Amino acid sequence: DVGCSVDFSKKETRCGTGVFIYNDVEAWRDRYKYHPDSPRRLAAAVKQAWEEGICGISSVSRMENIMWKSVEGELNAILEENGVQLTVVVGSVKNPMWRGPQRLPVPVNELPHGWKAWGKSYFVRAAKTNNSFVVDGDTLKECPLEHRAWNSFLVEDHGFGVFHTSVWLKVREDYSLECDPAVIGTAVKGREAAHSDLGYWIESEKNDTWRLKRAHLIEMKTCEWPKSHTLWTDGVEESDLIIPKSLAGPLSHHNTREGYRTQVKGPWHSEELEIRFEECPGTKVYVEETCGTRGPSLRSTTASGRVIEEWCCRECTMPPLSFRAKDGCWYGMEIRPRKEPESNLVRSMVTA
Amino acid sequence: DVGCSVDFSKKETRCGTGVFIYNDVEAWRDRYKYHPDSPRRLAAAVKQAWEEGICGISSVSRMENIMWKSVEGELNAILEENGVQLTVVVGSVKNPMWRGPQRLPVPVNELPHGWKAWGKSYFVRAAKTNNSFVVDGDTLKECPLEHRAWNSFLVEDHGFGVFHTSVWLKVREDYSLECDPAVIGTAVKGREAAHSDLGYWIESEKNDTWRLKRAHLIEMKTCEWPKSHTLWTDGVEESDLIIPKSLAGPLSHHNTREGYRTQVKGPWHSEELEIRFEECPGTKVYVEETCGTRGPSLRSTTASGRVIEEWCCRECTMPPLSFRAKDGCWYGMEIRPRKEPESNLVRSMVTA
Amino acid sequence: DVGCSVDFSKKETRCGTGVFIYNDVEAWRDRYKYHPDSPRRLAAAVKQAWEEGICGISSVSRMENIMWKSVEGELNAILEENGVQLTVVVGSVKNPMWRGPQRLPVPVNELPHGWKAWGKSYFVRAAKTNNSFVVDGDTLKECPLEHRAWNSFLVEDHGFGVFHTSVWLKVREDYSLECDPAVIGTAVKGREAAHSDLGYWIESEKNDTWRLKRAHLIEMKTCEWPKSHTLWTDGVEESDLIIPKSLAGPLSHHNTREGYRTQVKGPWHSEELEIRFEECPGTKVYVEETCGTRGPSLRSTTASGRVIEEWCCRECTMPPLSFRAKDGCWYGMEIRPRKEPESNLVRSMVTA
Amino acid sequence: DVGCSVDFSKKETRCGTGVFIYNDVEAWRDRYKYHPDSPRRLAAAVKQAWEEGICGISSVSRMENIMWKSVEGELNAILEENGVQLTVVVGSVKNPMWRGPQRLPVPVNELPHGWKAWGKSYFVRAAKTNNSFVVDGDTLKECPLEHRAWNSFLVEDHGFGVFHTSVWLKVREDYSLECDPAVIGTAVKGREAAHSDLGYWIESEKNDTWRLKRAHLIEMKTCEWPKSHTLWTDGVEESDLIIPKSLAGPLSHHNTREGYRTQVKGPWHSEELEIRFEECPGTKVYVEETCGTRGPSLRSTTASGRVIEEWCCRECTMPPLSFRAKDGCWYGMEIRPRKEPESNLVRSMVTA
Ligand SMILES: *[C@@H]1O[C@H](CO)[C@@H](O)[C@H](O)[C@H]1NC(C)=O
Ligand SMILES: *[C@@H]1O[C@H](CO)[C@@H](O)[C@H](O)[C@H]1NC(C)=O
Ligand SMILES: *[C@@H]1O[C@H](CO)[C@@H](O)[C@H](O)[C@H]1NC(C)=O
C-alpha cells in the first residue's frame, strides 16, 4: 500500500496507505500470461464432455479464447497417451460473442496415467482425428449453437513477480451468466469513480449527478454486470443502461445517460469499439421532434465512403452518441440521418 | 492519479494510473485553517441565534470544537464595530456528542464593518459581556440543551494538502441528521473494503460474505450514515449495526456482527474508542446457556484496579467484542460478569 | 535489484532492474558505526608499528578519524591488558590532511590473549601510559609529519539494512596512495556526469562542452583519484583542473573549465569547501586584461568585512570563479581586485 | 532521481536519490517509434546517396533494422510524391550482422514538397520502381555489401521515454564505427561489474579476480565497445577476450578468463546466443593435453541430434564454456570432443 503517489494534475508527490487500481487494458499485452490447470484433468473433462454430445466452446472473451490456443498440442498428446482419439480445433472469435447453452462437465477422476507435463509440453504434434472439438471460429455450419459450451471457467489466482503474470483457471462445476469478478473493480472519491473490467473500462463522473463519461470495448461479451462491485445499485434500471445488460451492462446510476437508452443493435459485431461523447468528424447531430424515432446503429460512412454531415433525433442530449469502431463511427439508435435514407447507411449488424 | 503500491504480504511492486485513499483517523485530522464561510458571517450567526433562544451549541464532532475554539477569541472582536454585545465560550466536548434540537441560522445581511476578521496582524481586543453563548463544556445550566444547536455545518473544501491545508466550511443551510459525505473515504477490492472519515475508521474483509473487522472511534457523533456511499445499502437492519445508526452507524452488511447487536449502551463516553474483536487482557469470555441477558457495557477494569476475568453470555461468537478505550476495556452489552455483581463493576451509563 | 524512480525534471517514474547510487555526502555525520575486525590484531599491529618507530598516524579521511576515535578505548584496553605501554590519543581534523610516509605493519600473529576486549569495544576501561600512539591531532612537534603513518588501511564490508552500516576494515597489506574505490560509484547519462564519494560531490554537464558546474568538498584530502572509476580520463591537463590532483583531483575532461587555471592556492584551509560558478554577492568581475596576474585566491571581503566590490580578470569567462567556505566568499586566482591593496586582501593559506 | 532498491540475496529495502540502470534484454523493453529525424531529410539523404551510388544500407543492429522496417513505406510515399523514384525494401537480419563502409550524406537542403509526414507510420502506398535502395534483407546481389551503408544514424533525444517511448535519430555528419553510448549503462559495486547496451548483456563476477560470469546475446553486431563506458580498461589482451572485439567485445579485464582464448569462430550465426560456463547436456568435458588443439566451435550434439558424451580440452578450466542457442549447446575452441568423428560435429561457420 506504500505508493509513489504523484498528483499529475497538481504535481503532488505523496505516499501512504490506501487501495490502488491500475489501467491494464492497454498494458494487457505485456503484463499477462494465461494457462489452464492440470491439463490431464482437462483432457478427462473434454473426453467426458464429448461423451455428453458436446460440439465445442464459443468463447465469450479474448482472455479465454487466447487460453484455448495454448495447450492444444499438450491436450491432444495427453488424449493420445491414454488412447482417446480427439482433435481440438480453435478458430477466430467474432463479436459479439454469443451465449452458448452447454457447460463443460467436471471429471470426478483423472486419467489412469500420464505424466507428459514433465519437461516438454509445447513442441508436440499429432495426427488429426475424425472427431472435431471446435473452439470459436466460423464453424456455425459444422455444429449448431445449442451444443456449444459457454462461460465454464474461473480465475482463482493471478499475478506474479516474474515479469509475466500467470493466471490459474479451471472448468466451472457451476452454471452462471455473470462476468468473472476476480478481474473487475471500481471505487469512488469525491466526484470520480470508474467501473473497470478486462475488456470493458467505464468512466463515471459527478457533473451535477453521477453520470457516464466514456467507455472502451475491446471485446463484446454476453455475461451480466454484477451489483456487488457496482456503485449505487439502488434505484437503477436496465433500459437506461446504454450498455445492454445482456451485454454485461452495469446496474448503476453511473451507467446511465440522459436522452439515451440501451443500445442493443449497436456495432456489437465490430472487433474493437469505443463509446466517445464527441461528434464524429464532419457530422453534426441535431435534436428535433420532427426527426425520426430510434433505429439500428448506422455507420457515419456510406459504403461509398461519403460522410453524412446531418443527423437528427427527437429526445437526445445533443450532440454526440457515436461508437468508435475500427470501421468508423456507429451512431446511437435515437440518432438517425436527417436527409440521407436510413437504408443507404451502413446499418449495424443484427446483435440485439 | 498516478502512484504506486508495495504490498505487505508480498514484495511485488508495479504502478501507473490509479485512484487512492488515505487514513486520517489516527492523526486526528491535522492542522487546518478552518475557514467557516466568513468569520464575520459566523459572528453574525450568533446575534440572531442568541436572539431566538440559542444560548449554546452541542458540537457534533471534535473538529467543530476545534473550529469554534480556534476562532472563539476573534468572534468577540468582529462584533465590536456594531452594537452587538456577545461573548463566546467554548468548553471541552463531552462524549457521546449528543444532538441539539436547535441549529445555527444563516444570516441574510452583513454587518458594515472592517473586514479584518481573517488575517489580522494581532493588536486588537473586544469588550466582554455578561451574556454568554456557551459552546459545550459544563454550561448545561447556563444553556439548556433545547436551546443548543448541533449538526448545523457542511463541509465545502478540505484540500490544499500541500501548503495551505484549509478545511473551508459553511453553515449547513439544511437541517441534516446524516453525516457529511465529503471527507468520507471508502472502496472495495477482492476480499477487502474499508470506510473512513474524519473521526472514524472502518474495515471490512470478505470473511464469509463480508462482516465487521475493526474500526476506531476518536469522537462519538450522533449523525447518520448515508447509503449511497456504503456497500450493499439494501439488505441490513439498523439493530444489527453493531454501531447504532444514531451514532452514524453505517447501513451495510459490512457493518454488523454475528451474535452481537447494536451497542446502544456502549462506552460512547470515552473520548476515544477503538473497536477490536479480541479478548481483553485477563478475561475469559464464556458462552453459557445459563448466563445473563444484555446490559450496558461494563468496563473490564474496576475503579479500585481489580479486574473481573471470567465473563459469559448466551449469544456470543468468538472473538469477543470489547471497546478498547483509554478508560480501559469495555465489553459489549451482551457479555456480562459470570458471577461478580454488575453493580460493583464500572457500568457504562446508558448511552442511547 | 529493482526499485522506484522519480526524475523530477520530467516526473518520469520508472521501475526495472539495475544499479542504484545514493548521495550520502550530507550523511557523513552519522553514516557508519563500527570497529575494525579483531581489535586484538590491530593492537598487535600498533605495538609492532611503535616498536618500528611509528609515533603517530595522520588520518587520511574523516571516516578514518571517526573510526580511530571510536575504537580508541578498546585499543587502549587491549594495550594495557597485555601490558603494552602505549596510549592511543586521537586529535582533531585539520584541512588539508597531509601524507604520512609510514604505514601500519600487518602483525605476523595477534597478541597472545585479548579476549577481554571481545564484546568490550566502546565502554572500555584501562589506564594511561607514557607512550602516546597519537592519531593526527595538533601534535606536529611531538610526532612530525614524516614520522606519521597514513593511508595504511582498507575496507572489507560496508552497507547494511541499518542507518549505521557496520564497516569492517583491514590493515593494508601493502603501500597505497590512491583513495578507496569500494565507496565510489559513478556513471554518465546524457548531459550529466557527477563524481561523488564519502566526502566530495562534483558535478559536470555538456553545455556545448563538458565543463565543470559545482563541487562540494566537505574535507580536503591528498590521495589520488583512481582511473578505473573515472569518466573521460583521456586528454586532460593538470593546470586546467580547477581542483589540483595533489588534493585528490579527478583526471577527467569533466574536471576542468576554460579561462581558469588549476586552484592550488584556494581556500584549502576551509573545513567545508563548496565550489560554484556564480557572481560573488555584493561584487562584480570584469573581463579586463589589465587585471592582476595569477597567484593566491582572495576573500571577497576584507578582514573587517568590508565588501571589495571592484574586481577584474585577465581572461575569465563570466560568470567568475569563487570558493564558498565557512570563512566566506573566496575568489579564483585569475580574478583580482581592480582597486584594492594586497594588504586588504585575505590570502588563502597554501600548503604543499 | 528518487528511486528505491530491494535486495534479493538479502531483503534490505530503501528509497533515495541517485541514478538507475534497467535491463531490457530479458524484459523485452517496450515498443519504440524510431523516428529518423525529418522524414524528408531522410528522403533527401537516401536520394543523394543513390545519386552517389549507394545501393542500400546494412542495419548494424536490430533496432535500426526495425527502424527501417517502420520507416520504409512512408519514405517511399514521400519519394514518389516528390520528383523522386526510388524504392526501399527491407527484410530479415542475418547473424552475424555485417559491416558497411558507406554513410548517408547529410542533405544540403530538404526536398521541395509539402511537409506532412512527421513520424508517418505507414498506411500509404507507392508505385514500385526497378531501382531499389535495399535495406538489410537478403538482397546481397542487388546491392553488394561494398556500397552498403553502416551506422548512418545517431540517437539524439528520448523524449517521452516512459510511455511514448520514442527514440529519435539523425543522419551523422561524421563517420563513426563506434556503437551508441547513450544506450549503454555500466558501473561497479563490490565484486560485480556488468556491461550492457540495447542488445548485449554481460555479467562479470570477481572470484579471486574480476572474471566473467555469464554472457547472453540476442543479436550479433559488428560495432565497437567504447572505452569511456567500461571498467578496468588497462592490462587487457584481445586473445583472452572471449568475445572478439570484432563483435564489439568490451575492452576490460572483466572480458577475459584464464585457460581460454578469444572465440572468433563460434556459433555467431545464432539469432539468440546465451553463453554459460557449463558442460553441454549429456556431455562430459575433461582436461587432456593430448586433446585436439583449438578449432571451430562444435555443437555438443550431432546433425541427427546424437549427444557426444566425452569431451577434452588442452587448457580449459572447469566449468567448460558452451554457447546456448536454439540451435543447441556448443563448445569453445579449446574444448574438442574426446573421441568423436569430425563429420557429426556441427562446426560454427567461420564468422569473418
Ligand atoms: C459540470 O460542472 C458543474 C457540476 O455539474 C455544473 O455547474 C455544470 O453545469 C456541469 N456541466 C457543465 C457543462 O459544465
Ligand atoms: C550554453 O551556455 C551558454 C553560455 O554559457 C549559453 O549561451 C547557451 O545557450 C547554453 N546552451 C548551449 C546548448 O550552448
Ligand atoms: C569464488 O569464491 C571465493 C572468491 O570469490 C573463493 O572462496 C572461491 O575459491 C572462488 N572460486 C570458486 C571456483 O568458487
Residue numbers in the entry:
A (entry chain K), B (entry chain L), C (entry chain B), D (entry chain C): 1 to 352
Give sentences from the paper.
Unexpectedly, we observed that ZIKV rsNS1 forms filaments. Subsequent helical reconstruction of ZIKV rsNS1 filaments resulted in a low-resolution map of 8 Å, which could be fitted with ZIKV rsNS1 dimers. These ZIKV rsNS1 filaments are flexible and composed of asymmetric tetramers (dimer pairs) stacked along their exposed wing-ladder domain surfaces which possess complementary electrostatic surfaces. In addition, ZIKV rsNS1 at a lower concentration forms a filamentous chain driven largely by the complementary surface charge interactions of the wing ladder. Here, we provide further evidence that the recombinant, secreted ZIKV NS1 forms tetramers with a distinct ability to oligomerize into filamentous structures. While the potential pathophysiological implications of rsNS1 filaments or microtubules are unclear and could simply be induced by the in vitro environment, such structures, as previously observed by us28 and others, highlight discrepancies regarding the true soluble form of oligomeric NS1.
The non-structural protein 1 (NS1) is secreted from the infected cell and is thought to be associated with disease severity besides its proven usefulness for differential diagnoses. NS1 can be found intracellularly, where it is essential for virus replication, docked on lipid rafts of the cell surface membrane, and abundantly secreted into the bloodstream of infected individuals during the febrile phase. NS1 is comprised of three distinct domains, an N-terminal hydrophobic β-roll dimerization domain (residues 1–29) formed by the intertwining of two protomers, an α/β-wing domain (residues 38–151) that extends out from the central β-ladder domain (residues 181–352) giving the dimer a distinct crossed shape. Here, we present high-resolution cryoEM structures of ZIKV recombinant secreted NS1 (rsNS1) and its complexes with three human monoclonal antibodies (AA12, EB9, GB5), as well as evidence for ZIKV infection-derived secreted NS1 (isNS1) binding to High Density Lipoprotein (HDL).
